[PDB]
């Protein structure tokens, strides 16, 4: 956990890679390159209940931990990439999407960027549930 060689005049930027997709939340802090990475925490790790894995408060507790490990290395600022769901699915933020952002900022982390990244199709393969969909 040894710092970089300059961080006293400028900030160093990691990338957040928030996943939000339903029944879970990931936060996964990486390098700028993203070819290597550091600690990775889920909301399913804080609270096991098989339904609080996507909980708002579980996502807050997650980012509240992650933001420590940032400062432990030297990372102080974050570009952020969001990910809804995609893959021919809902593509709508989870409950713990708004949550984690608000939490990591107020813990004491600077914001560099924040964007949408979703792997949306340009018209592709059939979706589970058949012609009449679900109905329960």
């Amino acid at each position: 956990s040894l710092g970089p060689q300059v961080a006293e005049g400028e900030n160093v930027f990691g990338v957040c890679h928030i996943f939000a997709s339903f029944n879970d939340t990931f936060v996964h802090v990486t390098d700028l390159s993203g070819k290597e990475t550091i600690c990775r925490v889920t909301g399913g790790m804080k609270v096991k209940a098989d339904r609080d894995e996507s909980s708002p408060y579980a996502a807050m507790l997650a980012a509240q931990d992650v933001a420590q490990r940032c400062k432990e290395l030297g990372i102080t600022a974050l570009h952020i990439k969001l990910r809804a769901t995609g893959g021919n699915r809902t593509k709508t933020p989870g409950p713990g999407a708004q949550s984690a952002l608000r939490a990591l900022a107020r813990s004491g982390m600077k914001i560099g960027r924040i964007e949408d990244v979703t792997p949306i199709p340009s018209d592709s393969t059939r979706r589970k549930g058949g012609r009449r969909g679900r109905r329960l």
């Binding site: 900030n11 593509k91 708004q98 900022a105 107020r106 560099g112 979706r127 969909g133």
Partner: protein, 99 residues
Amino acid sequence: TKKRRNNGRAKKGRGHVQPIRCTNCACCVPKDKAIKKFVIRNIVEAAAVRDISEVSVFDAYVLPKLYVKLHYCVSCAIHSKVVRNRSREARKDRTPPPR
């Protein structure tokens, strides 16, 4: 009887219309029967916006938006309540709801 003069929605001069899949029902309906609601929102939902904008490495930066086009079907529209029953003398409107 007939409850409509358009039956489904807008099929005029054409035979088959390409289908589309509901977002949440996951059902299958025509392109022109589905309620097509486009959506605009802020990333942070403009709720933590003051708390976010103040803490940054940039002086100013107005946040992106989240663009999603949702297609609901007959059942999944009524149940989530983006529509409701209307009077028999007032079904006939082409007018969006007041903004």
